[PDB]
Write the structure tokens for this entry.
Amino acid sequence: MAAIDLAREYISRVNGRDGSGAAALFAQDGEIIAPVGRVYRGWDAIAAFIEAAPPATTAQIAERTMGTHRVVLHGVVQTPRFAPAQIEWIFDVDGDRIRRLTINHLR
Amino acid sequence: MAAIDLAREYISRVNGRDGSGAAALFAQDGEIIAPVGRVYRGWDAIAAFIEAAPPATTAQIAERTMGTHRVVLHGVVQTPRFAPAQIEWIFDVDGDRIRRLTINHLRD
Amino acid sequence: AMAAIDLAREYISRVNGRDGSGAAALFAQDGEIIAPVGRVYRGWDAIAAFIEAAPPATTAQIAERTMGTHRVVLHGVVQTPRFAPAQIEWIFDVDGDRIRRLTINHLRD
Amino acid sequence: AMAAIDLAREYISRVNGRDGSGAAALFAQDGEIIAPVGRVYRGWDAIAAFIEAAPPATTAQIAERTMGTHRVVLHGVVQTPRFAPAQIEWIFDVDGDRIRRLTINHLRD
Ligand SMILES: [Cl-]
Ligand SMILES: [Cl-]
Ligand SMILES: [Cl-]
Ligand SMILES: [Cl-]
């Protein structure tokens, strides 16, 4: 699974509200930064983030950066409480797993 | 405006993404202390801190302490994508204005 | 015309000098700092305010982890008069000889 | 048996003595040090870790600004090798003969 394939499968997992399935894409010492300043390190914390964050339905996913080791996706997240939000997912990949995902809310 | 009213109006104005209006609740040398050890002193600096916030709603407010000069609110900040955050706002109030607001993130 | 590594090193030098304006001048007009917790300071005045809000601190033991034409990662130690040393990562995205975005991640102690 | 002001004075004395275990033993088991705001040391192990990692720098002219049965505010000047003298504020929340929370603020000129 290439970096772009991991990024796409992560988005698929989150759309299914499948925290454990998303966590299995990360290295054991992988982490989600969401947002900057709030870090979820390791499989348990990553699955807990997905489970605690609102139920996500993504749309209009665009691949902004794509390489063997880094992928940037931009997309729109629809949620029960807010206007559609432009979200940026920055994936750092090594060894066929995600080492770090940083999630920015674009203004 | 009593301290509890200033605290409630601050939450209302941040929910409106109104940096200028939130800042006018503070004394001219009032300050916000926020992560990590950042001190925003004065109306311009407080408005900048407020305007840097993610789009969010701040609700489920519990009034933990209330007095003439100190108010503590607990609440939940929700955002489109991130997990709900438990927040504590500690308002030090003197003479109809906020002198210091300390913002503590609480355990999830 | 400063290269990305030059902008990154100068940013650190300006922050050690408490110099919010000089640090802001390293950014594009619509450049930004993303800092805890999800705070985005966009534009020169906001960046200046963020920098001025820092406590007296010195930023040293810089290791240049990544350097290229358009992206720089620095790791460093921030020391203060009373608080514990903090391990910090600065990620600079650079375009057209200015910083488009600086992301500031706290690392494990 | 120790009053709130006694807890605060003993905390400063144990930190000045570089005794992180002894300072932690003044706190509730789920007590915390916030130092600075946004950086939280929860529980005795983390509190000992803060004390051991923070500068040994010493509080000299400690002033007792606020005291009561459940809250104490101390102000003092800490002098460190590489900074100007720094005005520091220690805010102790006390319940049941133990420190529930200590917040450490670096006061700005
Ligand atoms: Cl996500
Ligand atoms: Cl706020
Ligand atoms: Cl910085
Ligand atoms: Cl201390």
In short: The first strand of chain C starts at residue 27 and ends at 35. Chain C has three helices and six strands. Residues B 14, 103 surround chloride ion (ligand 2) (CB under 6 Å).
